[PDB]
Amino acid sequence: SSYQIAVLAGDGIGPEVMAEARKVLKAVEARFGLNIEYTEYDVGGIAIDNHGCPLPEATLKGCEAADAILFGSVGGPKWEKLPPNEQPERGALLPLRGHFELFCNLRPAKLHDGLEHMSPLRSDISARGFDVLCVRELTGGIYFGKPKGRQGEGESEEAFDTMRYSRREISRIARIAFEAARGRRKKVTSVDKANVLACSVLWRQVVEEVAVDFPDVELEHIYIDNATMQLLRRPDEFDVMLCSNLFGDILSDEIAMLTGSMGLLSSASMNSTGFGLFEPAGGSAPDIAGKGIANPIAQILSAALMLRHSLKQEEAASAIERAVTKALNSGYLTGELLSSDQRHKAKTTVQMGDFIADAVKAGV
Amino acid sequence: SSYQIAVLAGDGIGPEVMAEARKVLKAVEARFGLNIEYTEYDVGGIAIDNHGCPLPEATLKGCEAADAILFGSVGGPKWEKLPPNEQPERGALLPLRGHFELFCNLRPAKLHDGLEHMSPLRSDISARGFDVLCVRELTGGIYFGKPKGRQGEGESEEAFDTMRYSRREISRIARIAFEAARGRRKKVTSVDKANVLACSVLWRQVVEEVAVDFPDVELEHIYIDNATMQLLRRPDEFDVMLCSNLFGDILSDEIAMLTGSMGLLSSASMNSTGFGLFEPAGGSAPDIAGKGIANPIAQILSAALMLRHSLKQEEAASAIERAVTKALNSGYLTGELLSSDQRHKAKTTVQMGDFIADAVKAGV
Ligand SMILES: CC(C)[C@H](C(=O)O)[C@@H](O)C(=O)O
Ligand SMILES: CC(C)[C@H](C(=O)O)[C@@H](O)C(=O)O
Ligand SMILES: [Ca+2]
Ligand SMILES: [Ca+2]
Ligand SMILES: [Cl-]
Ligand SMILES: [Cl-]
């Protein structure tokens, strides 16, 4: 019936961009007759300010009462002297993922036509283009493995983290990657360090076991140091990249930055029942906050991921995506998408959201 | 008195490039009156073929009787179906590092003048240039931490690796990085994941403790997912990058590939007594082997690192480096350094070594 969304806009540009996502959602709600109710909750640094911790009890409970979390961004210089476990970004995101079992992170990164010049890639590499989905295991591996901590004092004081995966954890993230490849270009590149790590040995072994169910999908394996090199040089050769938690973290940010256009990229972190956490791929960009400069496209597109993946509102999700395409091909781009001689054509955050929501209303 | 070198040329191009390094060493030996004796030992795939394992007992003992290991490259398709712990690359390199306590890996990567076009970076980024030394902790962390293995069966079978660092391990790699920065551009970027990992919390804490002894060196910290993004985009902003084992592995290969010219880059892995293992940064490139095509500069420069760091032959090391510079500025470049319209000017491996050794002889 009537969906419930926990809106966790966080810090920096999170609120001003979330305002545009919500604006575009309003247009989609009216066009498709969706009944979505939203409640806002403090998270990250504003929650520390307001409630003394990055993930208040009340915010968590709001997320459990929701069908999805629409999440902005967290962190900023203000909290960047806090002891590393009280800090906003890890203190909002890791417990969210752990509590809701959001084991699947999807971060698709593509080079958009006309924006090749912005890619830090050499012009003939960006001109080939790319389109790489990183599928990253989000609730296991070295992030949540135990023992973690430290023992001892002085020179022999040591600290430790345990990277741990079971067959079950690996197979459920691998199926996600194969299924995604199946509807893309039918190739999974599994990324590990199987020459060094026992988790990676089992990782590679299991993802190969999952492959039997996808005889139309090509699987190759690559070590993470090789994957990071190869993506800099021929990112067009990857379709779906399938990674454990630490590796996926590194790789997803790497190809996102290779696009040159992070303010266009969004993220889905989902559990097996369709609940998920939907967010822009970039940070809270505190330096540009409250200035009407941030690109809201990433947050807008996060709301379209939320519609699709949690609310099963595929039409609505697709309408927002095309209203974004339309912006991008009708000269509605924020300042960071424009070369320095074109930076005077920059639209503000409000202008971007206004356009994109008008487009949805107009039947794009 | 008379130095002893264990020559472990390995597989692929390792031998034909090592022949050029040895040729250039002969010229340096004659010019500086150095008495260097060399013994060759099988390692990697040729050792599996010849002795049934990648690091024969006899090879190890040859390395213990040596002042340094001059190491080529290991691995190739031939051994790439072996169970992952019998494989040549990990089976030669990790036990070498562990046995000789080679905790310090130095991999300097710079963009050479005139070779900017080869960098996968966008032209205005490569034109700024860069010069980044990755200092990577090589004997600890998740590579050698215990417990490592697996337990269980079926879906609940799990495997595990332990990332472990002590204050002592961190402080000795950090001093190396600060000392290196001190003689470069006086900045250390320490790379960790302190927002997630207990090893990284202690890592950051300790490297900050080491910093007190280097008040002329700026220290900043960066997370590894951010470091991999930032290096793609503004690699000119880094001087020394200081990393743990897994992270340094990823980062050193990333900036090496950002140079566009891996066949020029070499590696030093050294213990605290000056013994070390010296090797080209790139692999065994099996596809181009025995064809007189491989760039020997990386192996030649590995021999100059060996002279400097193990044999305390600074003059000799410097003479080889300048003979390399001279090649590179006198039109002696192998095929992979030349744009496709200039690829007819390519020199062979023998021609490169001949030139570089002539240059040393001539008093470069
Ligand atoms: C903030 C940090 C814990 C987080 C991660 O490592 O997952 C961030 O890097 C990300 O990619 O969401
Ligand atoms: C082969 C592998 C074990 C090794 C490493 O991870 O150290 C290689 O990647 C390297 O960089 O030397
Ligand atoms: Ca990240
Ligand atoms: Ca490597
Ligand atoms: Cl992991
Ligand atoms: Cl490590």
Of A120, A161, A202, the CB nearest to B198: A161
Interchain contact A82–B (C-beta under 8 A): no
Phi/psi at B216 (nearest 5 deg)?
A: -80, -5
Instruction: Please state at what angle helix B349-361 crosses helix B14-32, rounded to 10 degrees.
Output: 10
**Which residues, 6+ apart, have CB-to-CB distance to A350 below 8 Å?**
A20, A292
Of A157, A194, A228, the CB nearest to B254: A228
Minimal Cα–Cα distance from B28 to chain A, Å?
Answer: 34
Q: Which of B49, B213, B225, B345 is catalytic?
A: B225
Distance of CA A137 to CAs A209, A229, A270, A358, Å? Answer: 17, 21, 10, 37
Burial class of residue B183, CB neighbours in 10 A (0-12, 13-18, 19+):
exposed
Q: Which of A131, A161, A253, A354 is catalytic?
A: A253
Distance CA B30, CA A320 (A): 73
Ligand 2 nearest-atom number relative to CA A193? 6
Beta-sheet strands, E only, within A11-50: 36-40
> Under an 8 A CB cutoff, do B202 and A233 touch?
no
Peptide bond into A83 cis (omega under 30): no
In DSSP terms, which residues pair with B40 in a beta bridge? B7
Distance CA B245, CA B138 (A): 5
Contact A42, A59 (CB under 8 A): yes
Distance CA B105, CA B107 (A): 7
DSSP for A102-148, written as a single string: --EEEEEEE--TT-GGGSSB-HHHHHH--EEEEEEE-SSHHHH-SS-
> Under an 8 A CB cutoff, do B167 and A155 touch?
yes
Contact B184, B239 (CB under 8 A): yes
Concerning whether B165 is annotated as a catalytic residue, the answer is: no
Hey, how many other C-beta atoms are within 10 angstroms of the C-beta on A113? Answer: 10
Concerning whether B146 is annotated as a catalytic residue, the answer is: no
> Under an 8 A CB cutoff, do A167 and B150 touch?
no
Under 8 Å CB pairs connecting chains A and B tally to 190
A167 residue type, one letter: R
B10 residue type, one letter: G
Find, among A53, A13, A58, the residue nearest to A39 by Cα: A58
What is the edge-to-edge ordering of all strands in the sheet holding B104-110? B36-40, B3-10, B68-73, B276-280, B266-270, B104-110, B131-137, B240-243, B187-192, B218-223
Beta-sheet strands, E only, within A211-338: 218-223, 240-243, 266-270, 276-280
Interchain contact A159–B (C-beta under 8 A): yes
Distance CA A351, CA B74 (A): 57
Tell me which DSSP letter residue A214 carries. -
Find, among A231, A129, A133, the residue nearest to A181 by Cα: A133
Concerning whether B49 is annotated as a catalytic residue, the answer is: no
Q: Which of residues 273-332 of B touch A (CB under 8 A)?
A: none
> Considering just the CA atoms, what is the radius of gyration of chain A in Å?
20
Of B89, B198, B257, the CB nearest to A159: B198
Contact B303, B70 (CB under 8 A): yes
Interchain contact B121–A (C-beta under 8 A): yes
A1-364 belongs to CATH 3.30.2320.20:
no
For residue B193, the ligand closest to its alpha carbon is 1
Contact B317, B45 (CB under 8 A): no
